[PDB]
Amino acid sequence: NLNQQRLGTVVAVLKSVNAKKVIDLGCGEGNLLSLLLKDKSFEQITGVDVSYSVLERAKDRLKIDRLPEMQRKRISLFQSSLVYRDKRFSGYDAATVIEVIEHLDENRLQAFEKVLFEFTRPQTVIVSTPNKEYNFHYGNLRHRDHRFEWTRKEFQTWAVKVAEKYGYSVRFLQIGEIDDEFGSPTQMGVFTLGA
Ligand SMILES: [Mg+2]
């Protein structure tokens, strides 16, 4: 329920900017989608993932085929490699990117940046990713490997550059309790279209 607070923060930011149509790029099992559906202010909720299997799990977890008609019309899910200009990315007020960028290599990240800030180009973009430094402060072996997480400097440097490259302004947030010098477990950049 630690992630529940993180996702809750994303929802609050969206509401704070009055976003009514939201697209979650890399929706996974739809944990954010679930929270969005609980707030009637969100008129269109769209989840996108690279994996067919994941999306199938999401729809099962969201029990979409059981939701009332009015609720079913608010949500949409579809598969995408997040590399090409897909017309289905257009028209949203905000795009959310949670647990995505820290998994992309140089080529895929650059491609995703275009898709996000040039193709989708919503008024607000919310990017959330782990603060690697948090793990510096001393159970699956692979899950214990945090080398691919970004430090706060790496994330902010990246955010500032893309914001500048695509005509967005960006601000940073610290999600979770701050551990003095190691920072919080999660870092978030909120991008706003325009300078
Ligand atoms: Mg996600």
CATH code, domain with 61? 3.40.50.150
Rounded to whole angstroms, what are the CA distances from 192 to 17, 39, 146, 167, 170? 10, 22, 29, 9, 6
Q: How was this structure determined?
A: X-ray
Residue 33: burial class (beta carbons within 10 Å; 0-12, 13-18, 19+): buried
Dist. CA 82 → ligand 1 center (Å)? 12
Q: Would you state the structure tokens that stand for residue 4, as one six-digit string?
A: 């529940």
Residues 171-181 as b or e (16 or more Cβ within 10 Å = b): eeeebbeeeee
Dist. CA 17 → ligand 1 center (Å)? 20
Coil/strand/helix, residue 136: helix
DSSP for 91-116, written as a single string:
T-SEEEEES-GGG--HHHHHHHHHII
The sheet carrying 186-193 orders its strands as 75-79, 44-49, 21-25, 94-98, 124-130, 186-193, 168-175
Dist. CA 70 → ligand 1 center (Å)? 25
Dist. CA 130 → ligand 1 center (Å)? 12
Residue linked to tokens 């939201």: 22
Domain carrying residue 66? 1-195
Beta strand 94-98 with 124-130 is parallel
Looking at the structure of the chain, the number of domains it has is 1
- The response to whether 98 counts as a known ligand-binding position is yes
Which of 12, 86, 8 minimizes the C-alpha distance to 46? Answer: 86
Task: Enter the resolution in angstroms.
Answer: 1.9
Dist. CA 27 → ligand 1 center (Å)? 4
Residue linked to tokens 């949203």: 92
- The response to whether 8 counts as a known ligand-binding position is no
